[PDB]
Write a protein that binds this ligand. Structure first.
Ligand SMILES: NC(=O)C1=CN([C@@H]2O[C@H](COP(=O)(O)OP(=O)(O)OC[C@H]3O[C@@H](n4cnc5c(N)ncnc54)[C@H](OP(=O)(O)O)[C@@H]3O)[C@@H](O)[C@H]2O)C=CC1
Ligand SMILES: COc1ccccc1/C(=C/c1coc2nc(N)nc(N)c12)C1CC1
Length: 186
């Protein structure tokens, strides 16, 4: 298996969701960037794996489930099998990463992408080893009820450039945002 990564878009007040949707209006090209980053695999004959919590899975409209061209794994202790449209179910992040090493996936998975929500990001961000965060800073406050965990900059280094990531300020629907990549290795 290849690298472990988290990807998120977050407002200035650290918001990532409100009432199971976006705190902000849809940002079409920001979403395109999410699709591109999570779908594109460096390794021939492999797909990337996305790992998400149960609330995040059900926040994807029923017609957009699963995220196409990626292997979709949901984290839940309540569910007894993968939800309709999902491919895998694990009871913990540790278990999901272990699964990625089993016969069924060990040869099929390139990058792994944690795509929410707050508790899955927090566990991933605190997991020892090499990990990158791809963070879109939406540069306005938006009312939220779910928040991105603290990024400890003693460990996470903001990279000065990254291939395939635009470095200038973006704007859609009057909302400015910018892309960042952070890397730790501990
Ligand atoms: N980039 C962005 O702005 C993103 C925004 N979002 C937003 O965030 C919100 C949803 O996120 P959030 O509320 O945090 O919820 P989660 O997706 O993380 O879902 C929480 C549920 O998933 C399960 N879960 C989470 N972590 C684990 C774990 N380690 N092991 C097993 N099960 C786990 C639990 O389910 P159970 O009870 O079944 O055990 C828990 O109740 C929405 O607003 C959505 O729009 C989501 C992703 C990205
Ligand atoms: C309601 O949100 C969606 C609806 C349909 C399909 C995918 C999504 C998702 C989006 C983003 C997750 O991390 C993200 N990170 C970035 N920078 N942007 C995003 N847009 C997501 C998350 C998985 C539920």
């Amino acid at each position: 298996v290849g690298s472990l990564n988290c990807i998120v878009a977050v407002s200035q007040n650290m918001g990532i969701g409100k009432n199971g949707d976006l705190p902000w209006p849809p940002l079409r090209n920001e979403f395109r960037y999410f699709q591109r980053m999570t779908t594109t695999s460096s390794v021939e004959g492999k797909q990337n794996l996305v790992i998400m919590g149960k609330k995040t899975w059900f926040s994807i409209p029923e017609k957009n489930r699963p995220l196409k061209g990626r292997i979709n794994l949901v984290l839940s202790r309540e569910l007894k099998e993968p939800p309709q449209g999902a491919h895998f179910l694990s009871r913990s992040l540790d278990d999901a990463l272990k699964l990625t090493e089993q016969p069924e996936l060990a040869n099929k998975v390139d990058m792994v992408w944690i795509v929410g929500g707050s508790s899955v990001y927090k566990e991933a961000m605190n997991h020892p080893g090499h990990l990158k965060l791809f963070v879109t800073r939406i540069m306005q406050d938006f009312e939220s009820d779910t928040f991105f965990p603290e990024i400890d900059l003693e460990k996470y280094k903001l990279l000065p450039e990254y291939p395939g990531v635009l470095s200038d300020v973006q704007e859609e629907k009057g909302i400015k945002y910018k892309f960042e990549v952070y890397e730790k290795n501990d």
